[PDB]
Design an enzyme around this catalytic site. Structure first.
Site, PDB file in Angstrom:
ATOM      1  N   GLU A  63      43.991 -76.342 -25.029  1.00 30.83           N
ATOM      2  CA  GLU A  63      43.528 -75.688 -23.803  1.00 30.83           C
ATOM      3  C   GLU A  63      44.625 -75.838 -22.754  1.00 30.83           C
ATOM      4  O   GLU A  63      45.062 -76.951 -22.464  1.00 30.83           O
ATOM      5  CB  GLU A  63      42.233 -76.329 -23.300  1.00 30.83           C
ATOM      6  CG  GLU A  63      41.172 -76.524 -24.373  1.00 30.83           C
ATOM      7  CD  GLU A  63      39.969 -77.327 -23.876  1.00 30.83           C
ATOM      8  OE1 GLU A  63      39.320 -76.904 -22.890  1.00 30.83           O
ATOM      9  OE2 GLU A  63      39.680 -78.385 -24.473  1.00 30.83           O
ATOM     10  N   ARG A 118      16.804 -63.827 -13.889  1.00 27.96           N
ATOM     11  CA  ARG A 118      17.956 -63.296 -14.585  1.00 27.96           C
ATOM     12  C   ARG A 118      18.128 -61.774 -14.470  1.00 27.96           C
ATOM     13  O   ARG A 118      17.177 -61.009 -14.628  1.00 27.96           O
ATOM     14  CB  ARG A 118      17.892 -63.672 -16.061  1.00 27.96           C
ATOM     15  CG  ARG A 118      19.162 -63.249 -16.783  1.00 27.96           C
ATOM     16  CD  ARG A 118      18.924 -63.056 -18.242  1.00 27.96           C
ATOM     17  NE  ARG A 118      17.898 -62.057 -18.533  1.00 27.96           N
ATOM     18  CZ  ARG A 118      17.175 -62.069 -19.651  1.00 27.96           C
ATOM     19  NH1 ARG A 118      17.395 -63.022 -20.572  1.00 27.96           N
ATOM     20  NH2 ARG A 118      16.250 -61.136 -19.859  1.00 27.96           N
ATOM     21  N   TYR A 149      20.102 -58.612 -16.213  1.00 24.56           N
ATOM     22  CA  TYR A 149      20.867 -58.164 -17.370  1.00 24.56           C
ATOM     23  C   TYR A 149      21.631 -56.889 -16.986  1.00 24.56           C
ATOM     24  O   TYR A 149      21.027 -55.840 -16.775  1.00 24.56           O
ATOM     25  CB  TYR A 149      19.903 -57.918 -18.521  1.00 24.56           C
ATOM     26  CG  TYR A 149      20.511 -57.446 -19.815  1.00 24.56           C
ATOM     27  CD1 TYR A 149      21.055 -58.351 -20.726  1.00 24.56           C
ATOM     28  CD2 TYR A 149      20.492 -56.100 -20.156  1.00 24.56           C
ATOM     29  CE1 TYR A 149      21.594 -57.915 -21.934  1.00 24.56           C
ATOM     30  CE2 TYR A 149      21.024 -55.655 -21.355  1.00 24.56           C
ATOM     31  CZ  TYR A 149      21.571 -56.566 -22.242  1.00 24.56           C
ATOM     32  OH  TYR A 149      22.093 -56.112 -23.437  1.00 24.56           O
ATOM     33  N   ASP A 171      24.813 -54.390 -17.987  1.00 28.74           N
ATOM     34  CA  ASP A 171      25.824 -53.914 -18.918  1.00 28.74           C
ATOM     35  C   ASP A 171      26.037 -52.426 -18.648  1.00 28.74           C
ATOM     36  O   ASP A 171      25.082 -51.659 -18.640  1.00 28.74           O
ATOM     37  CB  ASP A 171      25.363 -54.143 -20.359  1.00 28.74           C
ATOM     38  CG  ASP A 171      26.352 -53.608 -21.380  1.00 28.74           C
ATOM     39  OD1 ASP A 171      27.458 -54.187 -21.489  1.00 28.74           O
ATOM     40  OD2 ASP A 171      26.024 -52.615 -22.073  1.00 28.74           O
ATOM     41  N   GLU A 180      18.246 -54.629 -15.906  1.00 25.74           N
ATOM     42  CA  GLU A 180      16.945 -55.269 -16.068  1.00 25.74           C
ATOM     43  C   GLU A 180      16.828 -56.558 -15.261  1.00 25.74           C
ATOM     44  O   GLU A 180      17.785 -57.336 -15.172  1.00 25.74           O
ATOM     45  CB  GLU A 180      16.687 -55.530 -17.559  1.00 25.74           C
ATOM     46  CG  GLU A 180      15.323 -56.124 -17.884  1.00 25.74           C
ATOM     47  CD  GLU A 180      15.328 -56.868 -19.229  1.00 25.74           C
ATOM     48  OE1 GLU A 180      16.103 -57.838 -19.362  1.00 25.74           O
ATOM     49  OE2 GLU A 180      14.567 -56.487 -20.150  1.00 25.74           O
ATOM     50  N   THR A 208      11.929 -62.100 -14.198  1.00 20.22           N
ATOM     51  CA  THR A 208      11.537 -63.090 -13.201  1.00 20.22           C
ATOM     52  C   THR A 208      11.785 -64.490 -13.756  1.00 20.22           C
ATOM     53  O   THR A 208      11.853 -64.692 -14.957  1.00 20.22           O
ATOM     54  CB  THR A 208      10.050 -63.021 -12.814  1.00 20.22           C
ATOM     55  OG1 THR A 208       9.243 -63.338 -13.959  1.00 20.22           O
ATOM     56  CG2 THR A 208       9.643 -61.624 -12.188  1.00 20.22           C
ATOM     57  N   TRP A 253      17.630 -70.182 -20.048  1.00 24.88           N
ATOM     58  CA  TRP A 253      16.264 -70.649 -19.785  1.00 24.88           C
ATOM     59  C   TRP A 253      16.077 -72.152 -20.058  1.00 24.88           C
ATOM     60  O   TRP A 253      15.485 -72.866 -19.241  1.00 24.88           O
ATOM     61  CB  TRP A 253      15.221 -69.804 -20.545  1.00 24.88           C
ATOM     62  CG  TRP A 253      15.301 -68.324 -20.212  1.00 24.88           C
ATOM     63  CD1 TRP A 253      15.797 -67.323 -21.010  1.00 24.88           C
ATOM     64  CD2 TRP A 253      14.911 -67.699 -18.983  1.00 24.88           C
ATOM     65  NE1 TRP A 253      15.730 -66.119 -20.352  1.00 24.88           N
ATOM     66  CE2 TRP A 253      15.192 -66.319 -19.107  1.00 24.88           C
ATOM     67  CE3 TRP A 253      14.346 -68.170 -17.793  1.00 24.88           C
ATOM     68  CZ2 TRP A 253      14.929 -65.406 -18.086  1.00 24.88           C
ATOM     69  CZ3 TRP A 253      14.082 -67.261 -16.775  1.00 24.88           C
ATOM     70  CH2 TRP A 253      14.376 -65.890 -16.929  1.00 24.88           C
TER      71      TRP A 253
END
Ligand code: ADP
Ligand code: ADP
Ligand code: MG
Ligand code: MG
Lengths: 470, 472
Positions: free
Chosen positions: A15, A53, A55, A57, A63, A66, A433
């Site tokens: 790294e 969250r 979503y 793309d 989307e 909750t 989650w």
């Protein structure tokens, strides 16, 4: 000793950090440099400080999911917070465009269908105990779900598609947006199949204690009382099942046989064939569940901590009863500020009356669509509610608070604490989650398996760890 | 019946999709612009790319590139060098992105361990080792070698005393190692931020019972390919001798960091180290003894059956290791002066000194010390020299170029690569990590890869098939 013990084939990795300088802030240099790779390869699941969250793309519908909620009103607050957050994204896009020469409007619709026939889900997730039997769902939950549209649908104007094969329904108002698509999904024997209820999803919980139940059949709702009735009625049905309270088995011979037809009939007279060989109307099925739910409430133990109160369930049942009496009597004047399909239909009827319009009039299509535009003051739902023509379940203040602050009674409370520290300390963190991880310097991970708990001392250690290295 | 069984408190959540449309660009361009601020602010800063590697990109921090998992020495070199190419491309594209805006200037990315302002940047090594060996016992036997390894593989730097520090122990001078002072500082502080040279306690990213992870922080970032080969290669032979219990003597030091900064300043390797057993050895003597044993080990080293680093490559490693130790002892570097970074750099520095009658603190030499590590081809000193035949190759441009887009074919990185390649070609989202791979649509499918050695997996084939079938 043993020469075969040396790992001559071994795993290894390096790294490397790079020094970044710009020669004529510098933070703007790093941001523009990272941009192409961040937008292309970053994970599309984006967790935000209120525990929810997004979503995102570029080829997909945006989307909002909750945060975990333990209370009916709280769930409503957080769903509405999603509309606020998504709307703000649209507003900011219009402004960044306007700053450039280009101008125009961004629309986000919370509905289930588009002009082209695409589908958009509003999905429910309910935690249940391994206690509840697989069998009960088909017997008890499912019949309620097939008919639930009568009480909570959002409404839509249906146009027959001339190229549709095998079936034709006439131009008409349906109480449900989702029913035709649900029918297709279930009917399909291909990769196109979508089951109405799914119990087998990753629970996002300790697997032994808890199952997650995923339901696809509901419309996206605007009016708060409609969300309350939709989820509220379903909660009562689950409790009765869990309590073995004596809800009769209504099990259907074929779940989707009547689903499209129920949508077209606001009298609820549609006839369903029970696996019994007997038949009942959609309305009769709802009247049965309602009457039992009404007796459940009389024996319902008050939750000792959080949960949904008996007082609040009484509001749910009050509206539920009033809606069934309206479907039965045909008089909607008691429910017509609370139930999406009814509110929408009442407006459509005024336009038809005044203009003498036909159901296919572009003016009506505009009502049916812009009812779902989430933009305050532009969208039709917003205008109606502001004038008192749609009743409130909750308050603007509570919805606004849920925009930045996570539910304080569940696991989301912990996810929220972590993300807020990350924001203030400036440290990078990766959450989901269950799994919560600080990536640097050393990769400290925490697993939150209990969705009910807002208290974990590991999370407290994690946050101090972050504070130490800030 | 049983009323107390009802969960009157239960967990619940809603997932809502919105329809998106613009009324007067490509709707793609509208979504992209709409999502950007939230993506930039809240998306995970660990970013996995098709060649199996991971970039850590966070506006606050140093950009870091972590190679895909590698099982062979040369392969590891290919993927470290691919990282410089990838990082350089980001810089070049940013230059042309900034040009659109009125901002003009040059982007520099340096692969070194220190800047003029005193910041530290790490080049860290990860090694899978056998879970048999107790974590601490491995360190003890690894440490003498690691503390002195800087002699053979250091990248060099010019140390400038801070005149405002009356407690500065070291003068203006050329150091063989970049990292030594900062490593010393991190180990000795009572402050909770003190960090160890060896860490075994990291998450294995492998079966917990089968394998242990070794994380090492003491090495310099290297430019010359044979420097990387020597640094990692010598370390592999030491780990092997330990695992085979080949009889490498226990050299345990009284104090790990006592001599670390001092060795850095002495290119004759005569720095003294106090051992636990009560004897004392020079840094050069520890290396000689380790190297002598590695040489006997090679004689008995079983050829790896599948992949791994061969005996021929290890012989190349020892050829270089031996020449370096001879140069250190004789003071004649003419044979290694194309292969070892600090040696290569010092040769350059000495030339300028002679041509100009320069002092070591001349800005010109500081510019050389820095720009050796500029990764831009044709602009960076290292790249200019390598072109001239002044720096020897361990690998080829072609292997490095291929490593830019295609993951190692021998490890679990192969599979992560296939999944990410399929996501790119199909235009569908997937979320991946070292071990976990998942799609949320149409139905969530998840696969865990616990075995870092395995390049073949049925669940992966099917995941890719599921993505293909459901793609737009
Ligand atoms: N099983 C393993 N054994 C040794 N090294 C590994 C293993 N898995 C991944 N690596 C390496 O470790 C580095 C990643 O560091 P790690 O701490 O595991 O994840 P991150 O650094 O992204 O949090 C990479 O260079 C990678 O190649
Ligand atoms: N233990 C739980 N019980 C019920 N719902 C949950 C639980 N944990 C998370 N959820 C909900 O699940 C939704 C998101 O799940 P998602 O990431 O789509 O999982 P999947 O793709 O496996 O369905 C959110 O609304 C969230 O609040
Ligand atoms: Mg790391
Ligand atoms: Mg989902």
């Amino acid at each position: 000793s043993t020469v075969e013990s040396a790992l001559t084939r071994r795993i290894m990795g390096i790294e490397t950090e790079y020094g970044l300088t710009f020669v004529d802030r510098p933070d703007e240099i790093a941001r523009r440099m990272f941009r192409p790779i961040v937008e292309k390869y970053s994970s599309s699941n984006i967790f935000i400080p209120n525990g929810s969250r997004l979503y995102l793309d570029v080829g997909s519908h945006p989307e909002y999911a909750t945060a975990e909620c333990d209370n009916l009103t709280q769930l409503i607050n957080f769903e509405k917070a999603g509309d606020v957050i998504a709307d703000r994204m649209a507003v900011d896009a219009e402004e960044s465009l306007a700053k450039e020469d280009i101008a125009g409007q961004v629309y986000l619709f919370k509905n289930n269908v588009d002009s082209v026939g695409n589908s958009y889900g509003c999905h429910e997730n309910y935690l249940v105990g391994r206690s509840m039997p697989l069998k009960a769902l088909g017997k008890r939950l499912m019949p309620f779900l097939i008919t639930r549209q009568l009480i909570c649908g959002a409404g839509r104007i249906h146009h027959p598609n001339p190229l549709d094969k095998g079936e034709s329904f006439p131009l008409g108002y349906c109480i449900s947006q989702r029913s035709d698509h649900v029918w297709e999904g279930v009917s399909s024997a291909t990769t196109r199949s979508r089951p109405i209820i799914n119990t087998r999803d990753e629970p996002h919980a300790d697997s032994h204690s808890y199952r997650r139940l995923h339901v696809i059949v509901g419309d996206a709702n605007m009016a708060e009382p409609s969300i309350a009735l939709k989820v509220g009625s379903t909660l009562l049905v689950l409790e009765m099942i869990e309590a073995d309270f004596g809800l009769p088995s209504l099990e259907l011979a074929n779940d989707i046989a009547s689903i499209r037809e129920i949508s077209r009939d606001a009298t609820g007279s549609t006839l369903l064939s029970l696996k019994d060989g007997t038949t009942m109307t959609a309305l009769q099925i709802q009247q049965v569940v309602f009457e039992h739910a009404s007796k459940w409430l009389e024996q319902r133990p008050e939750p000792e901590f959080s949960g949904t109160s008996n007082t609040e369930m009484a509001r749910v049942l009050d509206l539920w009863g009033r809606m069934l009496k309206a479907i039965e009597s045909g008089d909607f004047s008691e429910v017509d500020t609370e139930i999406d399909w009814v509110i929408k239909k009442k407006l459509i009827d005024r336009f038809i009356q005044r203009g003498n319009l036909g159901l296919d009039d572009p003016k009506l299509a505009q009502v049916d669509l812009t009812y779902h535009d989430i933009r305050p003051g532009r969208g039709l739902f917003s205008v109606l509610q502001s004038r008192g023509m749609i009743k409130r379940w909750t308050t603007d203040e509570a919805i606004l608070a849920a925009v930045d602050t996570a539910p304080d009674t569940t696991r989301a409370h912990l996810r929220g604490r972590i993300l807020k520290a990350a924001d203030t300390l400036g440290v990078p963190v990766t959450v989901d989650w269950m799994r919560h991880k600080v990536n640097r310097p050393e990769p400290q991970s925490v697993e939150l398996g209990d969705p009910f708990s807002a208290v974990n001392s590991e999370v407290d250690q994690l946050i101090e760890y972050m504070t130490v290295h800030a």
